[PDB]
Coordinates of C-alpha atoms in Angstrom, one line a residue:
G1 CA 0.2 0.0 0.0
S2 CA 1.0 3.7 -0.1
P3 CA 1.4 6.1 2.9
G4 CA 0.2 9.5 2.5
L5 CA -3.4 8.8 1.5
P6 CA -6.0 10.0 4.0
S7 CA -8.2 7.7 6.1
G8 CA -11.2 7.0 3.5
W9 CA -8.9 7.2 0.3
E10 CA -7.5 4.4 -1.6
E11 CA -5.5 3.8 -4.7
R12 CA -6.1 1.3 -7.6
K13 CA -5.3 0.8 -11.2
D14 CA -7.1 0.7 -14.8
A15 CA -4.8 -2.7 -15.2
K16 CA -3.4 -0.5 -17.7
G17 CA -0.6 0.8 -15.4
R18 CA -2.8 4.0 -14.7
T19 CA -2.8 4.7 -11.0
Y20 CA -6.1 6.3 -9.7
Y21 CA -7.2 7.4 -6.1
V22 CA -10.4 6.3 -5.3
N23 CA -12.1 7.9 -1.5
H24 CA -14.6 5.5 -0.5
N25 CA -15.5 7.3 2.7
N26 CA -16.4 10.4 0.3
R27 CA -17.2 8.4 -2.4
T28 CA -14.7 10.4 -5.0
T29 CA -12.6 9.1 -7.9
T30 CA -9.6 11.2 -8.2
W31 CA -6.4 11.3 -10.2
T32 CA -4.4 13.1 -7.9
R33 CA -2.5 12.3 -5.0
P34 CA -5.2 13.6 -2.2
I35 CA -4.0 16.2 0.1
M36 CA -6.5 15.7 2.4

């Protein structure tokens, strides 16, 4: 896993290398490193 993501944020991949951040607590799909 990757440290730095807030409580609720999760990182995933689109299988094709692309790493996106999916927050389950806020139901967000973010292509960006979460700052909060």
